[PDB]
Amino acid sequence: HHSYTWTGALITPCAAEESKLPINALSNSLLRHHNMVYATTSRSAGLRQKKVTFDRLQVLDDHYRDVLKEMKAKASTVKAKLLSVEEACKLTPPHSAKSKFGYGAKDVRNLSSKAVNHIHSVWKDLLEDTVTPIDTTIMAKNEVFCVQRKPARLIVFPDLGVRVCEKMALYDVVSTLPQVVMGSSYGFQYSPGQRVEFLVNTWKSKKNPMGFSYDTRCFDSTVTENDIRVEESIYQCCDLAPEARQAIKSLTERLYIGGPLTNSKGQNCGYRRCRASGVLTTSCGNTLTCYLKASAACRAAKLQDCTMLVNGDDLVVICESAGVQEDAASLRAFTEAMTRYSAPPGDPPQPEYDLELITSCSSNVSVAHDASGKRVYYLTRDPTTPLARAAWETARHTPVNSWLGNIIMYAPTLWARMILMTHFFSILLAQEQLEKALDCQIYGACYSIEPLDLPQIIERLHGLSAFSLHSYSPGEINRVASCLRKLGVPPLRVWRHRARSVRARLLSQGGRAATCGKYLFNWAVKTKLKLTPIPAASQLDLSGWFVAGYSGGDIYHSLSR
Amino acid sequence: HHSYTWTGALITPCAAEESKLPINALSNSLLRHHNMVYATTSRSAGLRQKKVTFDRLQVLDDHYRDVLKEMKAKASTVKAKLLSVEEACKLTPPHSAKSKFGYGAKDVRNLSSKAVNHIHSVWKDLLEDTVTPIDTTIMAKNEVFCVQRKPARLIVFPDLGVRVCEKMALYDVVSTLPQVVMGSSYGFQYSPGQRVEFLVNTWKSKKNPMGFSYDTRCFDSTVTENDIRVEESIYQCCDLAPEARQAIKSLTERLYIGGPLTNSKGQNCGYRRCRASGVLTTSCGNTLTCYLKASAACRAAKLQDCTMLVNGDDLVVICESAGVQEDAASLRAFTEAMTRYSAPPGDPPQPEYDLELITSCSSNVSVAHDASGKRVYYLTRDPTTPLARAAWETARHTPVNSWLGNIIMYAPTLWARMILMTHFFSILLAQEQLEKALDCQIYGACYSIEPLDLPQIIERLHGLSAFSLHSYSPGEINRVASCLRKLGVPPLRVWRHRARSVRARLLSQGGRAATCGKYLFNWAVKTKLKLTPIPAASQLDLSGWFVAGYSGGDIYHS
């Protein structure tokens, strides 16, 4: 029952890897303490291998089976469709890993006969064989962090032809089933603003609210064969075409439950018997399993009037308090249940009685004020990681631009507005790349977005108030300022000065560039501007943006109007 | 998670019920202490309701899931077929309870258009609907026992049309799957001789053998919705026609898992959420579930080199001993595991180091000696219940003749040979009914058998040795003797005297009756006869007798 077994072969890189922060002429304008930023590399994979390898034991009780029966009842109301081959390779990211069988993501997106012919053969094989383990590649991820150093996280994924097959059989299912099963508890159906609204309303609904986040140590590794088969039983509750049921059974037996691990050089590194981090079902499966085990644990701990919010392996619960001391006792019982269900904690959970002090999905609720002075709740987070990554992206082009995803998701924040928008629009202006579409990620899915569309995107997601927030909380201001001193980032006053320049430069360009200056940087001037609804914003097809999670799922979309 | 919920309406009888031993002119020749014998009736159904009604809790661990995965791997090798309507109709007992829809077992067996048409409507309904709970009738069983008084057992069964549908969908499965999944551990594949052989050889396979019987407290009531769904998942591993998969899913959802209980008067008595005692899957389901929970518990207890023998809810385990003090420790862990699995004990299990001292399926192994003096092991049991029922049957005609089933199954025993054969052949002779086919039950299935066929049947099942066993063990002799004194049954010496007379009478008739006198009572004369293989014996189609269990399954043969 070990999560993994290893042969000793090394997890190898695909090309040259850098760990030290690359430095160019723009670096010091953003961050000076270069030695604090680093990128993980395959050199530390062995340490991660150690950490994710352990034995799992599961003791399933009546609460567990009761919750599951409830979930299946809701799953039975779902009707899902099979995706055509063309539909599935249109969801493939342009730079997804090429197939070992002579074609790449470009060929897939182009519907080339070679890729399409191979895909149909992979599909036919899934239908005719439900036993043979499917090969997977294991890689160390290159991710940037700030010190105080963690080893690289690993990604396990099947070949390209198989990935397109997963979409055909399960795309509709993983996009629809989660919300039907868990209702308001499914986190990925919300925009950051909608998430804040749900948390605040829930908090307010309790007479004496108490809340806690639960961090499961290496969630993927805690996922057992039982768990993966339970997930498939939920998927099979849906009204599905016969071929889809066959494909789902086959993919569960041959891929989801486990399989061999091959490095980039083609050597066998070992075997996996836990969740694969790079399959279409990683997000949905984790959310379902996290919801199941947590719901059952709440019952076991006798938690009163619980409301949960789940995003994959991330969980936050808000309930009725039973007194501070009693709540502490309740959490130990909750944790004991989770442990029995194979979901032990990394950091032990602690009860919070202030909503703003709860961090879930790396974020927390905070308050500011709009133009009218009205209090407004919004989503924020510690900016350390977003700034560390921005520093890297300042001197290196990366496959995914975290700064852009951060501006989109954290547009209302003090730090995203004053530092990220200021710094990157300055670089884009200098290279005249305002209209150059860049790749970013939202809830794990990849989107190609032109920076010029930001004002419209922001208005649609957060409302015009994102362009006028002020009087942030002392707690938030202090966290931002502390982080800047730690990283050696210039203080907010410097950013304000620079923004005025960026704004004027954008305005001088006229057109959409002007709108960017007008809306994104109104916070920079003494005499603020009007700021009315942008006409073209309504035409942006934003449906699909906040429907489901797809981390490790190999999903792409292009922004279209 | 309660086994049952009740409305308060009474479980009612379907006719007059007798609790006191009926007495005729023949009674006293067999039993004098008439007050020791009684039959359970609906008057005690309330008490039974209290014993079987409780809340179930289950904690399923890795050992449980590991065993289950192994079981499904084996079940995946099974290929089962659907029975036609005619084949299923033929399996229906001639006196099975009639349908509430205007036809009975005679009509079913005859393939009458009315019965066949309704059967088809029930089948079609099972395919189209997999949600609506199916109605069931709850009755108090009338069973005879010797005192020192237990409450009536309850039987729950669906309508005749549904019963025939269960046959079409699962007869082949419940008949084949158990032995495939459990191998030598499936009890119903053996005749009593083969069961003794398996127990003996298993005992010998251990360097230091240790064994124990495990009695679960009202097993049927401990069976949960989980258990019943796990059973269906095993059935589904088989290679089945899609129509059979649908019918099985439907029967599981609508009947097996639970359903309303209706009394004989048509009033709702409550709801069942545990095993129904009167459905086709009762035997196979109980066997699968008992084996799953036990196999897993053996692992949890760290029992060494275990070999199990399962017959429904009856369990026996023989293993490699690790010392008395450790053996007792392991058993305690085994019981704790079973309890967690929702199978608490009625009587605390105890380790035995003497094979003959283990009682399983109400029986135990004993030893006698054949003509040559060779030691021979055979299956016996305390005869208190068989004799109590024989007394009842002496004065009352019953639907099932336990005396006949007991002669067939316990033919090698001291008590079945000297008392049962003597007493009943005497009565049959006097009424000239040796050739009258009587109904009896073997492993729950019903068989119509002519007493004149007994010599051949016995030879085929137990060998010629059954007609010559002697020098029974002191323990077995003493147990038989104590039982006779308790019930007021004439001592064995009297029975031997009577056998000489019954024997002479049979021989006087000539033909098959003479054969009965010759083979069945050779033990009664001082100058024993030849006893050679009976030619006609080979003709008997006994294939189907010891294949699977069918208790409560409404199954009939020849």
Per residue, the 3-state secondary structure of A491-547, as one string, reads CHHHHHHHHHHHHHHHHHHCHHHHHHHHHHCHHHCCCCCCCCCCHHHHHCCCCCCCC
Separation of alpha carbons B30 and B426, rounded Å: 12
* Token pair belonging to B228: 């019943």
- Asked if A61 has any chain B CB less than 8 Å from its own CB, the reply is yes
Please answer whether residues B58 and B226 qualify as being in contact, where contact means their C-beta atoms are separated by less than 8 angstroms.
yes
- Experimental technique: X-ray
Chain A hits for B1, CB-CB cut-off 8 Å, are 62
- Asked if B432 has any chain A CB less than 8 Å from its own CB, the reply is no
Distances (CA, A) of B206 to A326, B199, B296, B297, B379: 55, 11, 21, 20, 21
At residue B319, the 3 state secondary structure works out as strand
Separation of alpha carbons B11 and B267, rounded Å: 9
Chain A hits for B61, CB-CB cut-off 8 Å, are 57-60
Chain B closest-CA separation from residue A249 CA (Å): 13
**DSSP assigned state of B78:** -
Separation of alpha carbons B339 and B343, rounded Å: 5
Domain residue ranges of chain A, discontinuous segments joined by +: 1-55+133-158+258-273, 56-132+159-181+224-257+274-280, 183-223+281-361, 362-561
Q: Which residue of B has its CA nearest to A59?
A: B61
Strand partners, B136: B261
Separation of alpha carbons B194 and B367, rounded Å: 15
**Closest C-alpha to B97, from B556, B515, B558, B557:** B556
Size of interface A-B (CB pairs under 8 A): 22
Q: Which residue of B has its CA nearest to A227?
A: B65
Q: How many alpha carbons fall within 13 Å on the CB side of residue A158?
A: 26
Amino acid at position A433, single letter? Q
**Closest C-alpha to A361, from A377, A383, A379, A340:** A379
Q: Which residues does a gap of C–N over 2.5 Å follow in chain B?
A: 148
Distance of CA A398 to the CA centre of its chain: 17
Q: Which residue of B has its CA nearest to A68?
A: B226
Report whether A215 belongs to an annotated binding site: yes
Separation of alpha carbons B142 and B154, rounded Å: 9
Q: How many residues does chain B have?
A: 558
Separation of alpha carbons A187 and A286, rounded Å: 12
Distances (CA, A) of B92 to A15, A221, B139, B401, B546: 74, 54, 20, 18, 18
- Is the Cβ pair B57, A59 closer than 8 Å? no
**Closest C-alpha to B427, from B379, B498, B363, B359:** B498
Separation of alpha carbons A318 and A439, rounded Å: 35
3-state secondary structure A426-455: HHHHHHCCCCCCEEEEECCEEEEECHHHHH
* Token pair belonging to A282: 């990683």
Instruction: Say which residues have a Cβ less than 8 Å from residue A333's Cβ, sequence separation at least 6.
Output: A300, A301, A302
Separation of alpha carbons A43 and B70, rounded Å: 41
Q: Which residue has the tokens 């959802």?
A: B253
Please answer whether residues A395 and A24 qualify as being in contact, where contact means their C-beta atoms are separated by less than 8 angstroms.
yes
Chain A hits for B65, CB-CB cut-off 8 Å, are 58, 226
Q: How many alpha carbons fall within 13 Å on the CB side of residue A253?
A: 13
Q: Which residue of A has its CA nearest to B57?
A: A62
> A138: part of which helix (H) or strand (E)?
strand A136-140
Instruction: Say which residues have a Cβ less than 8 Å from residue A73's Cβ, sequence separation at least 6.
Output: none
- Asked if A65 has any chain B CB less than 8 Å from its own CB, the reply is yes
- Asked if A73 has any chain B CB less than 8 Å from its own CB, the reply is no
Separation of alpha carbons A304 and B208, rounded Å: 55
**Cβ burial, residue A227 (10 Å; 0-12/13-18/19+):** buried
Amino acid at position A269, single letter? C
Chain A hits for B339, CB-CB cut-off 8 Å, are none
At residue A60, the 3 state secondary structure works out as strand
Separation of alpha carbons B47 and B151, rounded Å: 6
Phi-psi region of A145 (alpha: psi -120 to 50; beta: other; left: phi over 0): beta
Please answer whether residues B209 and B353 qualify as being in contact, where contact means their C-beta atoms are separated by less than 8 angstroms.
yes
Chain B hits for A77, CB-CB cut-off 8 Å, are none
Resolution expressed in Å:
1.9
Chain B hits for A58, CB-CB cut-off 8 Å, are 61-62, 65
Binding residues of B: 215, 313-314
Chain A closest-CA separation from residue B296 CA (Å): 13
Instruction: Say which residues have a Cβ less than 8 Å from residue B91's Cβ, sequence separation at least 6.
Output: B83, B167, B171, B555, B556, B557
Q: Which residue has the tokens 């507005």?
A: A417
At residue A215, the 3 state secondary structure works out as strand
Separation of alpha carbons A94 and A191, rounded Å: 25
DSSP A292-322: HHHHHHHHHHT-EEEEEEEETTEEEEEEE--
Chain B hits for A60, CB-CB cut-off 8 Å, are 59-61
Separation of alpha carbons B176 and B288, rounded Å: 12
Separation of alpha carbons B475 and A107, rounded Å: 85
Separation of alpha carbons A512 and A434, rounded Å: 9
Please answer whether residues B412 and B464 qualify as being in contact, where contact means their C-beta atoms are separated by less than 8 angstroms.
no
Please answer whether residues A235 and A248 qualify as being in contact, where contact means their C-beta atoms are separated by less than 8 angstroms.
yes
Q: Which residue of B has its CA nearest to A1?
A: B62
Order of strands across the sheet that contains B556-557: B438-442, B445-449, B556-557
Separation of alpha carbons A299 and A63, rounded Å: 7
Torsion on CA atoms A340, A346, A352, A356, rounded to nearest 10: -130
* Token pair belonging to A220: 């993927």
Chain B closest-CA separation from residue A128 CA (Å): 16
At residue B51, the 3 state secondary structure works out as helix
- Start-to-end CA span in chain B (Å): 42
* Token pair belonging to A314: 């991330």
Amino acid at position B458, single letter? I
CB atoms near residue A430 (< 10 Å) = 10
Please answer whether residues A409 and A445 qualify as being in contact, where contact means their C-beta atoms are separated by less than 8 angstroms.
no
At residue B320, the 3 state secondary structure works out as strand
CB atoms near residue B23 (< 10 Å) = 14
Separation of alpha carbons A287 and A281, rounded Å: 10
* Token pair belonging to A481: 């300022």
Distance of CA A288 to the CA centre of its chain: 16
**Closest C-alpha to B119, from B137, B142, B101, B93:** B101
**DSSP assigned state of B275:** -
At residue B353, the 3 state secondary structure works out as coil
What is the bridge-based pairing of β-strands B438-442 and B445-449? Answer: antiparallel
CATH number of B183-223+281-361: 3.30.70.270
At residue B315, the 3 state secondary structure works out as strand
In B218-237, the residues whose Cβ lies within 8 Å of chain A are 226
**DSSP assigned state of A416:** I
- Is the Cβ pair A61, B59 closer than 8 Å? yes
**Closest C-alpha to A288, from A235, A252, A251, A341:** A235
Distance of CA A324 to the CA centre of its chain: 33
CB atoms near residue B548 (< 10 Å) = 25
Q: How many alpha carbons fall within 13 Å on the CB side of residue B536?
A: 10
CB atoms near residue A545 (< 10 Å) = 18
Please answer whether residues A82 and A244 qualify as being in contact, where contact means their C-beta atoms are separated by less than 8 angstroms.
yes
- Start-to-end CA span in chain A (Å): 50
Amino acid at position B130, single letter? T
- Asked if B65 has any chain A CB less than 8 Å from its own CB, the reply is yes
Separation of alpha carbons B72 and A54, rounded Å: 27
- Asked if B58 has any chain A CB less than 8 Å from its own CB, the reply is yes
- Long-range contacts of B131-135, Cβ-Cβ distance < 8 Å, separation of 24 or more: B131/B253, B131/B254, B132/B254, B133/B254, B133/B255, B133/B258, B133/B259, B133/B260, B134/B158, B134/B162, B134/B254, B134/B255, B134/B259, B135/B159, B135/B259, B135/B260, B135/B262
Separation of alpha carbons A485 and A481, rounded Å: 6
The three-point CA angle A323-A326-A329 to 5° equals: 150
Instruction: Say which residues have a Cβ less than 8 Å from residue A474's Cβ, sequence separation at least 6.
Output: none
Instruction: Say which residues have a Cβ less than 8 Å from residue A141's Cβ, sequence separation at least 6.
Output: A40, A152, A153, A154, A155
Beta strands in B194-280 (DSSP E): 209-214, 259-262, 268-272
- Asked if B2 has any chain A CB less than 8 Å from its own CB, the reply is no
* Token pair belonging to A19: 């760990």
Please answer whether residues A137 and A157 qualify as being in contact, where contact means their C-beta atoms are separated by less than 8 angstroms.
yes
Backbone angles phi, psi at A239, to 5 degrees: -80, 110
